[model samples]
Target: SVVEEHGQLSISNGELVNERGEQVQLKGMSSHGLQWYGQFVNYESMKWLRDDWGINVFRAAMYTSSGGYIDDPSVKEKVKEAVEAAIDLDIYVIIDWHILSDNDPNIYKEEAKDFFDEMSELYGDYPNVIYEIANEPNGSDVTWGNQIKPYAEEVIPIIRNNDPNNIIIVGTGTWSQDVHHAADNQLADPNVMYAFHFYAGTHGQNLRDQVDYALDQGAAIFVSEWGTSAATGDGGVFLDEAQVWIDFMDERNLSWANWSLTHKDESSAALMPGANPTGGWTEAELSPSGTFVREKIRES
Candidate 1:
């Protein structure tokens, strides 16, 4: 329904627009690190999320380190599975090169390029796929101009060469909270969008202000990852705070994917531990954050 309604998404005047040149805001879920939550990426589970949870977009968050793709490249197969599922389900899928504890994107510049090159070659024609070249570029030195920007500039062209038209998202500074820095130095590519992540408990109006600044400076911001918990993925669900942030995104017509869809024992994980991996989940099987996010997606 989503892909049929919107088709390919592109950046038009700092807005994610459909093929019909209308602004589109994608709401969905992001898988936890593929290395661990890989089981949930299959077609059955994804289909349930699409039909039951009302998700129109999904993300495969392939971590670059911490026993992820760099440690074992086999994890990439999990990402591929997610792409296939989203394509079959007719929803947008973000192939995320998640770089959190890695702290820098350049360390895997060559690897990222190769991965995107391969991915683009395989799925470039699909209007439902989006490439998030860098997930969250952190570290004190990872400024938009210095580290993150340079890394995106390098890795993006590689994707563009193979998948020229699909929208590509680049991460900003401070765990993608410093979008103002990205606004100061926006990517030259017309289809480029900037990643701005947030956790309702750990991030507040200050982060929204940053997004505001970026928007004013003409940068397209996408919440590729966010949570109702603390940034650590714990500290209880902050639905009130998340509600405020949701309102902010709604006002701006911004697109987003909630932090995760794992069944781990964490506040942000969507399912309860031992919940079905293939998605015949009862209402009781969902965690608090999961139910909240699902309701938000359905209502919107």
Candidate 2:
């Protein structure tokens, strides 16, 4: 069990620590979007990942605008179900406020506050719950100091008010590829970590160098989302290049979550189209990315 293996999680000196304050690294799968892939996140699937794929954490990427939280209030329940299920299974879970098309998080400020307020109030006490305040704050107009930082400033407090100990991951600018900017000016909260997203086919050594600089500056980093495909999410799988990134993360004991676990016909998605969303999938059912990631998770 994850709770037995790593114990309660906390951050110390830019590293994820267990209850004993021992450094730990968590590797897991991140769902694409709850709105489109909610069916795939049931307890059975989570159990399958834990028992079969050897995952210690799971990320529920609940979109804020795309038929998700703000668009449909009911989606919160779906996310809650997964969170509760993870708690039952004793595995760490991330409630991500997935902001993609909406580059600036400030666009739904009040909604975000309300959402986190409810989530923290409900699951804050659980050691298994981790809050990812923002998914990926992109766009050329957005800047770390001006947009992402301010958003974290407001949202972090909401989670802290209810739950003060669990980790909180905040997204950086440039679609979470700007960890260097965040490292220079990190959140005031010690428990907070910065998110760095990448696609092996698109972002290679350049992004790794930025993460290296961030770590050197004593910044806690989390690769909240990454893919073996191109930046577009659908392209050729660059396994060789991805191996390098994985090696870099593994050597440093950094926590990471793979891009997606959906059946969508995309290079990044783990499952093949029309896979068994409720788990019990075989090797034949796995897509190329799925096979690769499953093997990687097991090996890790």
Candidate 3:
């Protein structure tokens, strides 16, 4: 079993851990499934992460509406099965409590605690596992204040009580946009990893400076979400510069996962092609602009 000591997570070392306790080479992409349940389909694209891409890590989101809601009773059994499947494949799986609502902490605090508490108890003994408190707690800092971070601090102890060891990732304020700021405000938990979402340099090098400022914080960073586009409104074009940020993280031995793997199709998806225009998808699965962003993740 993987044990954390003095806030440092111990798994494999030597090449796996650089001088600064950073992961040396991590190649991963965020993935979503076609059929979450009912059919409960297994997929070839998922296997491609391990076989084709050599990706050992995968961050799978827990969509509330697709029946993985924390408040739902049936979700645990399916989630436990999913955890088992990922473990069977020898891949590290992150149980992301995906929440889109800004009132996430208030909406599902006890439910969140119970859900992760059960999961940590079930999978804490396993070496290849991680827990993310929330997917992306957007809105102002106030939204994540009483709700998100407090909930994370509350739930983490529950997980610790059962498992006692392993990594528990918590998002900083502003949906993990300001990693440096989050670190300053964060409660003291050494085993925890701070997540950073980067699509920096949306225009020229201005974003580059911001990324550098974030990097200067000198805390262990994980790019829980990132992509080629800015993810905002019209006139968005920064796929090329975003690749530069990817390379910069790679050099520092920082760990990251791409925004997403699936795009909404003509049948299920209408406007935006993908749910967010910045996510990763292929030519067959993408629009003309999506194709460029897809290549960025591939070659980066």
Candidate 4:
């Protein structure tokens, strides 16, 4: 059964457990694209994600740029309802603070606080939920070294004070993809795990180096966000070597969740209709990379 041990809450041998000496292997996929913002809490797709895809964990926004205003009277209710629904399915859910530029923490600190307080109070008892402190926080090193850490340092304790045993994930600066850099000079916290996004192809050596360092430090690390995209501009050249990295992490019994299950915009998406159909799904049609990702995940 899932229990808390050492400091982290984790799944032990197919059961959700807190992190202890025992290493938990999380076999899951990212569910953002499938269950966030525009999905409108569709149970059918949620089922498809968990049952068909063998995904036990899902990541989504606590506040999204596309939809769901934190100020709305119904926001808390909606969040509670969604969390309960996912828990009912025995699925692990991560309520992420998806901040865009203007929606950045500094701009919405009060709203973020109220939202988190309400959410932590509402779902604190449920071990299945993980509150991601923020999505991709950014500004300057002053923001990183000063504002961000202090914000997290302050808020994390509040969350713990209220929730006590819930897992809280925090990302680093520079697009939240610089975990290696942040990990090298991270702040101290008890029972808190550091997260990094891995778009293998994009941030090749940097991602690997970060993960490697965290491992060296014996720090609790999780690939909280990752994905395979045809858009190699971000540092996606390592796609071919991604499975190698994944396999290595698997051998060590690490936990990971891909970037998104689905996303929509001017660009093509993995789950968007007309994207991945047969070969792998994309804008033009299901392409090799799309099929590659979907199929590769299965093999893992």
Candidate 5:
């Protein structure tokens, strides 16, 4: 059975709790950028994830750029398809406004307002919907107070005005590494969790310490995206360090989603290049990192 059998989820004592008031941890995969991996985010693929991989949550990274939201309007429709699929399957899904090149979220402030306005209007009632306002806010200039917090403060209201119950995950500063800062100054809203993304090989104990601090400070944490490779998303899978990170998250009951479900050549991509995007892949189609991640998910 899926871990999400408890029904709707909420934040309680800095942990995600189910409708039964029991804390639950979600393990799943995140689509790379919907623009590049949109074809894989269909009903068939989601069904495979649910039945075979046993994933209870799926993330649709609707990138703001990279030929996504900024360049192609159809990307939103693709995200809708994923969301609807997740709803029909009775699983949680993250609607991510993935921001990369544009480190600051202010660039898409107006667009985000409109985009979330429509999303909240449509899927607001569904408990399966979770909004991830930002993906990874990098750059030394971006901070919890200045760039990230202000953006969440503004966009959160737009969502609350329509959908007031679902959980929201906000990305922290420095590629979602600065969860400690967000813990110090939170959004002052209920059912809101902080995003913490990491690459196990690159981010060692230092980042784990920050996560510990954030949890101690009563900040709900959700690892929306992570990889077993280096920070660059390419390299050998660091299984040892990945295990350490997994242990840390497990102890805290922190929910997590693997980096991707694409066929890209990168080490982070779960599937081999040219694997069928519509799902039903045999073991031979899996990359080394993909094999490692698939095993890890099953262990949960």
Candidate 6:
């Protein structure tokens, strides 16, 4: 009912504000690259998280390379399934163009345009849909001004032509940790926000400082992906550092989605290897990160 309560979201003075100009913080989970973790997403799983865990947002991360969207086009259907579930559930869903190994978004500029054009036309009117144009812009040459921002300038118009008003998040540098680059050289779109990601054990005060700098420079932000484990996603889940990050987001009223919600054998995964795909996950089925995030979501 959070979506019903908040209506549509927008940015106000570098914050996610509701229809009444009140701050809104969306807390939820993102699917692991959909190719391998497709089983974890469905209406039932989404409903379970909504009712039981109080998640108001869901992110469908469709990776572009490394056996992802470009590798096979069928992944779009899987994302549609997630989007439909979000629509049916009345929760906010982010249609993420999860570009990681693809490096510069310009590599798939035409493909990105076509994909967003189709997605915007199909789900543009829904209040639940959000768009993350790029997941992470890596490499030294993939500067925000020359490569990433230019790519967004080209791709954003495609979405705007169909969907005029929905929160569009652009990925930052170095796996989305370098948002200060984006804040300094900003996009003119009012509803646009920059993506900031971190791992509890790997990213410490330095990332937070960068985030602070971005905020100070009047940048709206969303932690579209973060993990309690190391950057590798297989190390220990750091609850203490995660607590600090959680407090930071809460302080700023920043919206976020955790790294993953699969039963994969990784520390970032919320569920155990044998957890049910269609929801009804017991306490035992949740990994430590899952349990912690569930409590964070349920804290009210």
TM-score of each: 0.98, 0.98, 0.73, 0.77, 0.97, 0.98
After superposition on all CA atoms, how large is the RMSD of candidate 3? 6.1
lDDT of 5 by residue, 183-274 (tens): 99988898999999989778588888889999999999999999999998988789889999889889988999999889888888899875
For each candidate in the order shown, give its overall lDDT on alpha carbons: 0.91, 0.89, 0.56, 0.58, 0.90, 0.92
Residue 197 in candidate 6, Cα distance off native in Å: 0.2
Instruction: Give me the runs in candidate 4 sitting further than 4 Å from their true place.
Output: 1-21, 31-37, 64-78, 141-143, 184-188, 230-241, 263-268, 272-293
> How high is the lDDT of residue 88 in model 5?
85
Model 1, residue 251: what's the lDDT? 97
Q: 1-300 in candidate 1: lDDT tens per residue?
A: 889889988888889999999999999999999988888889999999999989999999999999999999999899889999888899999999988888889988899999999999999989999999989888898888988888888888888888888999899888888888789888899999999898988748887887898899889989999999998999899999999999999999999999899999999999998689999898899999999999999898
Task: Give the candidate order by descending lDDT.
Answer: 6, 1, 5, 2, 4, 3
How do the residues 1-90 of candidate 2 rate in per-residue lDDT, one tens digit apiece?
787677678889898899998998889999888888889898999999999999989999999987877888788888898898898888
lDDT: worst 10-residue window of model 3? 1-10
- Tens digit of per-residue lDDT, candidate 6, span 1-300: 777889888889999998899998999999999998898999999999999999999999999998999999899999999999998899999999999888988999899999999999999988788899999999998889888899899999999999897999999888888898899999999999999999998758888888999999999999999999999987989999999999999988889999899988889889997789999999999999999999999994
Candidate 2 positional error at 39, Å: 0.7
- Indicate which candidate wins on lDDT: 6
Each candidate's number of clashing pairs is 0, 0, 0, 21, 0, 0
The segments of candidate 5 whose C-alpha lies over 4 angstroms from its true place after superposition are 1-4
CA lDDT, candidate 4, residue 278 = 19
RMSD of candidate 2 to the truth, in angstroms, is 1.0
Q: Higher-TM-score candidate among 5 and 6?
A: 6
Candidate 1: stretches off by over 4 Å: none
Each prediction's RMSD over C-alphas, in Å, is: 0.9, 1.0, 6.1, 5.2, 1.2, 0.9
